[PDB]
Ligand binder design. Structure first.
Ligand SMILES: [Mg+2]
Ligand SMILES: [Zn+2]
Lengths: 50, 358, 49, 69, 149, 455, 142, 216
C-alpha cells in the first residue's frame, strides 16, 4: 500500500486553523465521552458473563 | 444669546433595502413598513451653560426621570399546572419589564394567554399582549416584534394582570429612558487621536483639572416614541427633565429658606474666623443635584473658602458642605441666589426646548 | 435475585437509542451524553482510576 | 434563553429586531456556508442598531434556548 | 465573577447607569476591573481578548481565539485602528458622576465574564445568642446547616 | 427582667411601657459600636482586630465592607475571602475591645516593628500621579474647584481656599501639603519611582526623584510605595504614628487615600494591550539580545562537543556544564532598553504600576514584553524525565539546544509555543504545589512553636 | 485557575432542569457565545456573558480584585437566574403521616412557627415561604 | 412540516418501545437518520459559518506572528578581538538639536541622572573593555576574534584546570617550579603577555594528554 511520494504533497497553504479540523476530527472519533460508555457496554456484554 | 441651540432629531429606522431584512420581516411578522415606535437619537448643542448643568440634564434623562414600564401584578402569573415549565415567572417578568412603552395612560392592563396546540415550539411575541382595560389603544404603546419566551409543544402561558408601573431608572433600571450616544465639549480643542503620541490621552488639549467648558454637544437616544409624533415626544422628555431638576432644586430651596427654624437637613456653625459652615444633608439624592449646587455656588462665590459635596454609595444621601467668610444669613442668601441661578438656567433651557423643536 | 446498576446512556439504559425528542419529553437531557449512575436519589460518576 | 429585550450594557431595545435578526442571519448563513464565517455588520445596520459596541456584542453572541433544546 | 483568563472578582459596587463612566460614543462598562489585576498576574490573554472583541463587535464577527493559534498583537491593534478605533483600545471616557472627561484614554472593551457559583447569600450566616447545642459538650452545633455555631 | 429573672421577647411588653433600673436590654447593633473582625487562618497578632461598626442600611448588601488599607492586618483580599465578625455585648468585653484590641494598636507590626498599613495599588499609583511634576498635558496643576474636590471625601475638616481665585492653579504637591500640615513630619528619601535600572532610558524629572517633606510640606518629589506604601518602614505614615500616635496615622492613611483616589477620578488611569506591546524596532532588538544568549549557550555546547569542558575540582562535567548554561541564558540588564524604547513612561499604565511599586516588578514587565528566559526548577533546568536523555517528546534525545531544557524564547505578549507552554506549566504547577505545602508545613511548626513558647 | 473556575461558572446547568428536583443548582437565564471563542465551545455550551469591562481606576472600589458592577446591567438580567433547593422528608413508619398538625393535640409544636399556608400537609406551589414558616407538615404517634 | 413528523413519530416509537414492538429495532434505526437530518437543521440555526482573520498577503487564514526566530549571530557580538566578553555598561547619548555644543556624553548608569536630561537622547551602548560601540561591532574581524578566543579558551581552560593543579604536579602554587607564576600576576591577569605564551607552550603536551584521559 505504497503512498505517493512526499516530494509532491502540497502543504505550503496548510494553516494551523486547518489543523483545528484535525483536532475536531479526533474529538468526533472519540466522542469525548464514548470510552466509558463503551467500557460499561463491554462489561455488561463480555465481562460480567465471563 | 441662547443656551440650547438647534437640535438634531434622527430616528432609527429599519433599512428594508437589505434583502434579508425585508424577507425576514415579511416572513415572520408580515412587516413591510416602519414599526409604530422607533428609537430616536437626539443630538443637542449647548452654549453658555456649565458642564454640570448639561451633565445633570443627561443624568436625569438617563435614570432620574420618572418613566413607565410593564409589570405583572402579584398573582398575575397563573402558576396553574399546564403552563410551560421553562418560561418561569421571573424570566417572563424580566422580559416584560424591559419592553419599552410609550404609554400616555396608566390604566392600561394587558393579558398574555398563549397556548401551543401544535408539535412545534411556539414563540410568544409582543403582539400577543392583548389589552383588556379602559381605553382601547388608538396607537400601540410597544412594538409587536419583541420576543417573549417560547412555548414547548402542548404547553401554555397565562399572565392576566400586566399593568403599567411608574418609577425612576435609578431605583430599577427598567425605567431607564435615555441611553448615552454622544457627549463632547465644543470649546476645547482636540488632538488628532489617531496619532501615536496622543493615542494614550483623551484628546482634549486642556487638562480636565484646569478646564471649564461652556459649549457642549450632548447626544441621547430615546428607545421608543411614536413614529408620527417624534418631535412632541422629544420635547416632552426634555421639558420633563428640566421640570424634574427645577423641582428638586426647589426642594433644596425650601430647606435653605427654613434656616432659622431647626431642621436635620441643614446645620450651621460659625467656626473660628467669622466663617460659617453650612452642611446640607439630603437623603436619596444623586450626584446631579450635588454637582449642580457645588458648581453654581462656586460660580456665585468665587472667593469661597470651601464648597464640596459627597454622595457616598452607602448612607444613600447627598451631603453638601459650604464654608465661607460670611455670616450665617449672608451665606444663606448667597446660596439662595445661587439656587435661583440654577432655576433660571433650567427655565431658560425649557424655553429654548419649546422654541427649538416645536 | 439481584439487580446491577445501569449507567445512563449504555446499551441497557432505556434511553440508549431513543430519539432526542423522546429524551426531551421523557424528562432527560437531549444533549447530555450520559455515563453516570442513578442511585438513591443522586447521580454518580465512576471516574477513571 | 433568548436575545435580551434590551442590551444589558446600555438598554437599547435590541429585542425589537432580535426576531428579524435571527432569521436574517440564518438566511445569510445559508448563502455563505466551523463557527462564524460571516460578517453581520450590514444586517445589523439595516435593522437600525447603531454602531454601539455593546448592542452588537449582545445581539450576535446571545445563545437561543430553542436552538439547543 | 471571573474572566476566562482566571481573574476572580467580588462585586462591591452597584452604580446606576448615570454614575457609570462613559465614552464619547456613549459606551459604558458593565464591570470595572482594576488595572492592578494585570501586572502581577500576567493575564495578557484577557487584554488581547478585549482588543479582539472590540474589533469583533464593530465587524459583527466572532473570532476563534484558541490557544497556540497564531497571534500578532501588533496586527490586531492595526485591525482596531482600521475599524475606526484607536491603535490601542482606549477611548475618551467621561466620569459619569461629574461629567468630567478623564485626562487619560481608558481601555474599555468587551470581555467574556463568568459568574462563579459562590453566592454570598448562601455563604453569609449570622446567629443570635441562643440555639441548638451539642448534648455532650454543651457547645453550639457546628456550622450554618445546624442553625447555630 | 431582674424582678422576674427572666428574658421577655419584645412582643409581650405592652404592659411594661417602661424599663426599670437593673433591666438588661438587648438592642440592635448601631453605627459606632465596636466589632471584632477576624480572618482565618489567624496567624498574626493583627489577625483579630476591633473595628467601629458602620451599619449599611441598604437591604441588598450582605458583605462585610472594609477599607482596602485594612486588609494588610488580615492578609486578606477580595477574591472570595470570608471573615468572621462578632459584636461584643458584655460591658467588660466592650470596654476591652475599644481600649485594647482596636486596630490602631496593630498599625505597627509586632513582627517587624514597622507599619502594617498604607496605600495599596489604586492609591500608591494615585499618590504618584497626584504628586508628580509634569503630566503629558503639561504641568500637573488644577484650578481651585478641582483642588477643593480632592478634599470632598477626606472626611476631615476641609482646608481654606479663600486665598485662591477661581482661575488660580494649585500644584499637586500643594494640596498634599494642606493635608500633611495637620500632622507635620520631616521625611526625605528617594522615591520608588526613581530606579537605577530605568535611569539610562527615560528622562527623570529632577523634581520627582527626591521626595522631601518639611514639617508636613511636600516641597519636592513624588509619593509612592517608599513613602506611602503599606509596610514601608520610615514612610510618612510610620513617622506620623511616632509623633502623633497610630490613630492619627490611620486617619492620614485614609485622608491621603481619598486625596489620591479623587485625583485619579479626573486624571484617569488604565492599562491597555498596547502598553505591553513592543515597537517592531525594539522587538528586533529583543531577538538580537536573546540570540546573543543562545549563541553563548551554543559556544558552551561546541566546547562540550570537542571535550573542552573541564569541570572544577568537586563538580562533575554534567554539573559544571549545567552550571555554565544557567549562566549563559541569564537575561542581561540591557533587555530593559527595548522595553523602555517602546514605553512612554508618562502615560504607560503597566510601567507606572511597576515603577511606582503599586503592583508588579521588573521581571513581570520583562516576561510580558521581552521574554520568559530560562525556566528554573530548584535552581536547575528542566530535567530529562520523559525518557533516557529526553525532556519532552518534542525534543530529540540528548538535545543540546537550550530550548529543550526550559529556555523560553518568546514573551507572554508574543505567545508561547506548545513546548514553551509545557515548560511554563511545569514551573506553574511547581509553584502551586509549593503554596499548598506552605500552608500545611507551617501549620505543624506554628502549633509546635506556640505550645513550646506560650507559657 | 481558569480550568478550576470554568467548571464552577453559572449557566444552563441542565437542559432538563424543570423536570429535576436538585439541590444547590443555579440556572442562569442568559448566556452568550464569547466574541473571541475557542475550540472548546464547539462541544460545550458557553457559560457567561460578553461584558463590556473598563480597566480603569473608578473611586477605588475595585482594589484587591474587586469589581464595580453597573446596577443597570444587573437589573437587565446580567448573570441573573434561578437558584434551586430541595426539601425531602420521609415517613418513619405507619405511625407518621402528612397533614396540618392540629393545634388542639399539638404536644410538640415548634416555638414561633407559622403552621399556616399548609394545604394537605404541604405548602401550595407558588407560595413564598419565609424563615419562620413550616413546610411539608408531618406528625407522629398516630 | 418536518417538525410535526419528527415529534409525533418519536412519541409513537417510544410508545412502541414500551409495548415491545416487533419492528422497533428497524423503525428506530431509520428514525435516527431521520432525526440526524433534522438535527443538522437545528445545528444550522446555531452555527454561523467557519471564519478566520484573513492575511492580505496570503488570502487564507492569517498566520503572521511576532514569535521568536533563532538567527544564529556572529561571535563578534559576544567577544572582542582580544577574546574578552563585552560589558555594555557605558551609555552614549546624542543631542536632539545640533546647536547643543557637547552633543555627546558617555556616562555610566549612576551618572545618567546627574548629567543627562531631556536635551539629549540615548544612543547605542559602548563596551568598557574594548571601547567599541554596539552598532559598530561588525567592524571587529571575526577571524581575529575566533583565534583570540581559541587562545583565550585554551589559556582559561589551562589555568582553570591548573587552578590548584600544577603542570609539574603537586599544587605548590606559591612559587615552586612553574606552577603559578614567573613573577607578577601573570597567571590570572592574562594581559602581561608572552608569559602565558611561553608557559602554556612549555606544558602544551600535558594539556593534550590530560584532556583525552578525562574524555574516556
Ligand atoms: Mg483571597
Ligand atoms: Zn447597548
Amino acid at each position: 500500500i505504497t503512498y505517493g511520494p512526499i516530494e509532491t504533497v502540497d502543504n505550503e497553504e496548510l494553516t494551523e486553523a486547518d489543523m483545528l479540523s484535525f483536532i475536531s476530527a479526533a474529538v468526533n472519533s472519540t466522542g469525548l465521552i464514548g470510552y466509558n460508555i463503551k467500557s460499561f457496554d463491554d462489561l455488561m456484554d463480555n465481562g460480567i458473563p465471563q | 444669546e441662547k443656551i440650547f441651540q438647534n437640535v438634531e432629531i434622527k430616528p432609527f429606522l429599519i433599512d428594508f433595502s437589505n434583502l434579508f431584512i425585508k424577507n425576514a420581516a415579511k416572513k415572520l411578522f408580515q412587516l413591510e413598513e416602519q414599526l409604530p415606535l422607533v428609537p430616536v437619537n437626539v443630538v443637542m448643542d449647548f452654549k453658555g451653560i456649565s458642564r454640570a448643568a448639561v451633565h445633570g440634564l443627561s443624568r436625569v434623562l438617563q435614570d432620574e426621570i420618572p418613566n413607565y414600564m410593564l409589570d405583572i401584578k402579584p398573582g398575575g402569573y397563573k402558576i396553574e399546572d399546564s403552563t410551560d415549565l421553562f418560561m418561569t415567572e421571573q424570566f417572563i417578568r424580566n422580559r416584560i419589564n424591559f419592553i419599552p412603552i410609550y404609554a400616555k395612560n396608566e390604566t392600561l392592563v394587558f393579558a398574555l394567554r398563549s397556548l401551543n396546540n401544535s408539535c412545534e415550539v411556539k414563540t410568544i411575541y409582543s403582539r400577543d399582549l392583548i389589552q383588556v382595560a379602559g381605553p382601547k389603544l388608538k396607537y400601540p404603546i410597544f412594538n409587536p416584534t419583541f420576543e417573549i419566551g417560547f412555548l414547548q409543544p402542548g404547553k401554555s402561558l397565562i399572565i392576566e394582570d400586566i399593568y403599567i408601573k411608574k418609577g425612576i431608572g435609578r431605583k430599577h433600571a427598567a425605567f431607564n429612558l435615555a441611553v448615552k450616544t454622544h457627549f463632547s465639549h465644543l470649546d476645547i480643542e482636540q488632538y488628532p487621536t489617531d496619532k501615536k503620541e496622543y493615542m494614550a490621552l483623551s484628546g482634549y488639549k486642556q487638562s480636565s483639572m484646569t478646564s471649564d467648558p461652556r459649549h457642549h454637544r450632548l447626544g441621547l437616544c430615546f428607545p421608543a416614541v411614536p413614529l408620527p409624533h417624534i418631535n412632541q415626544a422629544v420635547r416632552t422628555y426634555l421639558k420633563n427633565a428640566c421640570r424634574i431638576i427645577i423641582g428638586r432644586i426647589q426642594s433644596i430651596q425650601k430647606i435653605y429658606e427654613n434656616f432659622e427654624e431647626p431642621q436635620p437637613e441643614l446645620v450651621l456653625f460659625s467656626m473660628d474666623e467669622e466663617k460659617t459652615k453650612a452642611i446640607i444633608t439630603i437623603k436619596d439624592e444623586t450626584h446631579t443635584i450635588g454637582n449642580l449646587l457645588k458648581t453654581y455656588i462656586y460660580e456665585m462665590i468665587p472667593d469661597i473658602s470651601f464648597v464640596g459635596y459627597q454622595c457616598v454609595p452607602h448612607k444613600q444621601e447627598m451631603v453638601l458642605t459650604i464654608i465661607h467668610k460670611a455670616s450665617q444669613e449672608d451665606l444663606i442668601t448667597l446660596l439662595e441666589k445661587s439656587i435661583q441661578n440654577i432655576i433660571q438656567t433650567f427655565q431658560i433651557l425649557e424655553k429654548n426646548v419649546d422654541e427649538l423643536i416645536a | 435475585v439481584s439487580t446491577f446498576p445501569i449507567m445512563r446512556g449504555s446499551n441497557r439504559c432505556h434511553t440508549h437509542h431513543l430519539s432526542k425528542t423522546a429524551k426531551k419529553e421523557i424528562g432527560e437531557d437531549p444533549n447530555e451524553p450520559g455515563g453516570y449512575f442513578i442511585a438513591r436519589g443522586g447521580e454518580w460518576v465512576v471516574d477513571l482510576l | 434563553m433568548l436575545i435580551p429585550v434590551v442590551c444589558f450594557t446600555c438598554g437599547f431595545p435590541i429585542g425589537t429586531y432580535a426576531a428579524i435578526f435571527d432569521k436574517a442571519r440564518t438566511e445569510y448563513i445559508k448563502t455563505k456556508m466551523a463557527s462564524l464565517q460571516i460578517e453581520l455588520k450590514d444586517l445589523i445596520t439595516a435593522l437600525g442598531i447603531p454602531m454601539r459596541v455593546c448592542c452588537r456584542t449582545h445581539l450576535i453572541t446571545t445563545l437561543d434556548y430553542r436552538k439547543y433544546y | 465573577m471571573s474572566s476566562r483568563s482566571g481573574n476572580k472578582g467580588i462585586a462591591a459596587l452597584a452604580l446606576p447607569t448615570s454614575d457609570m463612566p462613559f465614552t464619547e460614543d456613549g459606551l459604558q462598562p458593565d464591570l470595572i476591573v482594576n488595572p492592578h489585576s494585570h501586572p502581577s498576574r500576567m493575564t495578557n490573554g484577557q487584554m488581547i481578548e478585549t482588543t479582539v472583541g472590540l474589533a469583533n463587535a464593530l465587524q459583527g464577527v466572532v473570532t476563534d481565539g484558541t490557544a497556540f493559534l497564531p497571534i500578532n498583537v501588533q496586527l490586531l491593534s492595526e485591525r482596531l485602528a482600521q475599524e475606526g478605533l484607536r491603535f490601542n483600545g482606549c477611548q475618551k471616557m467621561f466620569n459619569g458622576q461629574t461629567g468630567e472627561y478623564f485626562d487619560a484614554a481608558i481601555f474599555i472593551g468587551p470581555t467574556y465574564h463568568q459568574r462563579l457559583q459562590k453566592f454570598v447569600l448562601d455563604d453569609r450566616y449570622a446567629v443570635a445568642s441562643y440555639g441548638p447545642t451539642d448534648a455532650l459538650t454543651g457547645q453550639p452545633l457546628d456550622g450554618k446547616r445546624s442553625h447555630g455555631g | 427582667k431582674q424582678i422576674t429573672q427572666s428574658v421577655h421577647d419584645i412582643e409581650g411588653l405592652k404592659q411594661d411601657f417602661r424599663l426599670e433600673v437593673g433591666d438588661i436590654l438587648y438592642r440592635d447593633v448601631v453605627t459606632g459600636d465596636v466589632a471584632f473582625f477576624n480572618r482565618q487562618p489567624s496567624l498574626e497578632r493583627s489577625s483579630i482586630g476591633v473595628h467601629r461598626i458602620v451599619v449599611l442600611e441598604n437591604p441588598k448588601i450582605s458583605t462585610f465592607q472594609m477599607n482596602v488599607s485594612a486588609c494588610a492586618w488580615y492578609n486578606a483580599d477580595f477574591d472570595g475571602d470570608q471573615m468572621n465578625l462578632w459584636v461584643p455585648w458584655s460591658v467588660m468585653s466592650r470596654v476591652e475591645a475599644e481600649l485594647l484590641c482596636s486596630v490602631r494598636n496593630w498599625f505597627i507590626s509586632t513582627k517587624s516593628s514597622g507599619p502594617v498599613n498604607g496605600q495599596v495599588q489604586d492609591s500608591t499609583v494615585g499618590s504618584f500621579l497626584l504628586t508628580r511634576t509634569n503630566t503629558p498635558m503639561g504641568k500637573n496643576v488644577m484650578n481651585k474647584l478641582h483642588a477643593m474636590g480632592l478634599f470632598q471625601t477626606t472626611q476631615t475638616d476641609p482646608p481654606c481656599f479663600a486665598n485662591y481665585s477661581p482661575t488660580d492653579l494649585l500644584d499637586g504637591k500643594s494640596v498634599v501639603s494642606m493635608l500633611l500640615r495637620q500632622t507635620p513630619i520631616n521625611y526625605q528619601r528617594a522615591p520608588t519611582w526613581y530606579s537605577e535600572v530605568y535611569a539610562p532610558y527615560m528622562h527623570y524629572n529632577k523634581q520627582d526623584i527626591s521626595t522631601q517633606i518639611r514639617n508636613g510640606e511636600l516641597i519636592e518629589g513624588v509619593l509612592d510605595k517608599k513613602a506611602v506604601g503599606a509596610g514601608s518602614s520610615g514612610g510618612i505614615y510610620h513617622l506620623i504614628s511616632r509623633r502623633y500616635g497610630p490613630q492619627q496615622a490611620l486617619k492620614m492613611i485614609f485622608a491621603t487615600q481619598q486625596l489620591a483616589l479623587n485625583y485619579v477620578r479626573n486624571a484617569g488611569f488604565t492599562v491597555s494591550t498596547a502598553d505591553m506591546l513592543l515597537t517592531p524596532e525594539a522587538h528586533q532588538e529583543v531577538q538580537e539580545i536573546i540570540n546573543e544568549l543562545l549563541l553563548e549557550s551554543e559556544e558552551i555546547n561546541n566546547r562540550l562537543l570537542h571535550g573542552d569542558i573541564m569541570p572544577p575540582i568537586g563538580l562533575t562535567t554534567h554539573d559544571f556544564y549545567e552550571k555554565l548554561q544557567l549562566n549563559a541564558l541569564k537575561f542581561p540588564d540591557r533587555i530593559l532598553k527595548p522595553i523602555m524604547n517602546s514605553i512612554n513612561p508618562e502615560t504607560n499604565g503597566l510601567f507606572q504600576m511597576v515603577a511606582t511599586g503599586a503592583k508588579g516588578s521588573n521581571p513581570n514587565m520583562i516576561h510580558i514584553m521581552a521574554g520568559i528566559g530560562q525556566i528554573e526548577i530548584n535552581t536547575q533546568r528542566i530535567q530529562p524525565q520523559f525518557s533516557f536523555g529526553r525532556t519532552l517528546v518534542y525534543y530529540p534525545r540528548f538535545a543540546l539546544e537550550a530550548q529543550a531544557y526550559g529556555f523560553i524564547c518568546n514573551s507572554y505578549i508574543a505567545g508561547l509555543t506548545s513546548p514553551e507552554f509545557i515548560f511554563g506549566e511545569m514551573n506553574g504547577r511547581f509553584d502551586l504545589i509549593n503554596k499548598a505545602l506552605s500552608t500545611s508545613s507551617t501549620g505543624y511548626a506554628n502549633r509546635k512553636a506556640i505550645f513550646g513558647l506560650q507559657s | 485557575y481558569e480550568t478550576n473556575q470554568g467548571r464552577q461558572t453559572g449557566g444552563w446547568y441542565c437542559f432538563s432542569w424543570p423536570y429535576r428536583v436538585d439541590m444547590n443548582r443555579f440556572f442562569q437565564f442568559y448566556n452568550e457565545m464569547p466574541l473571541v471563542k475557542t475550540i472548546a465551545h464547539n462541544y460545550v455550551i458557553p457559560n457567561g456573558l460578553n461584558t463590556i469591562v473598563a480597566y480603569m481606576i473608578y473611586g477605588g472600589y475595585n482594589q484587591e480584585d474587586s469589581v464595580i458592577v453597573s446596577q443597570s446591567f444587573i437589573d437587565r438580567g446580567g448573570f441573573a437566574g434561578t437558584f434551586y433547593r430541595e426539601e425531602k422528608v420521609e415517613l418513619e413508619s405507619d405511625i407518621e403521616s402528612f397533614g396540618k398538625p392540629d393545634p388542639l393535640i399539638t404536644k410538640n409544636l415548634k416555638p414561633g412557627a407559622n403552621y399556616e399556608k399548609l394545604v394537605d400537609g404541604f405548602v401550595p406551589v407558588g407560595t413564598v415561604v419565609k424563615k419562620g414558616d413550616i413546610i411539608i407538615g408531618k406528625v407522629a404517634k398516630i | 412540516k418536518t417538525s410535526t413528523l419528527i415529534y409525533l413519530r418519536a412519541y409513537e416509537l417510544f410508545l412502541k418501545y414500551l409495548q415491545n414492538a416487533p419492528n422497533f429495532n428497524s423503525e428506530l434505526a431509520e428514525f435516527k437518520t431521520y432525526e440526524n437530518a433534522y438535527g443538522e437543521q437545528k445545528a444550522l440555526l446555531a452555527q454561523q459559518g467557519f471564519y478566520n482573520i484573513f492575511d492580505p498577503n496570503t488570502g487564507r487564514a492569517d498566520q503572521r506572528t511576532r514569535l521568536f526566530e533563532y538567527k544564529r549571530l556572529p561571535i563578534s557580538t559576544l567577544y572582542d578581538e582580544r577574546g574578552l566578553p563585552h560589558k555594555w555598561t557605558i551609555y552614549v547619548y546624542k543631542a536632539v538639536d545640533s546647536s547643543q555644543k557637547p552633543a555627546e556624553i558617555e556616562v555610566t548608569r549612576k551618572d545618567v541622572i546627574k548629567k543627562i536630561d531631556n536635551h539629549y537622547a540615548l544612543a547605542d551602548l559602548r563596551c568598557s573593555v574594548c571601547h567599541v560601540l554596539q552598532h559598530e561591532v561588525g567592524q571587529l574581524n571575526i577571524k581575529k576574534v575566533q583565534t583570540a578566543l581559541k587562545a583565550s579558551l585554551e589559556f582559561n581552560t589551562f589555568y582553570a584546570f591548573y587552578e590548584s593543579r600544577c603542570p609539574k604536579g603537586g599544587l605548590h602554587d606559591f612559587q615552586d617550579k612553574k606552577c603559578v607564576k614567573c613573577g607578577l600576576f601573570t597567571y590570572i591577569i592574562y594581559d602581561h603577555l608572552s608569559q602565558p605564551e611561553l608557559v602554556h607552550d612549555y606544558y602544551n603536551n600535558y594539556k593534550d594528554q590530560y584532556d583525552k584521559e578525562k574524555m574516556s
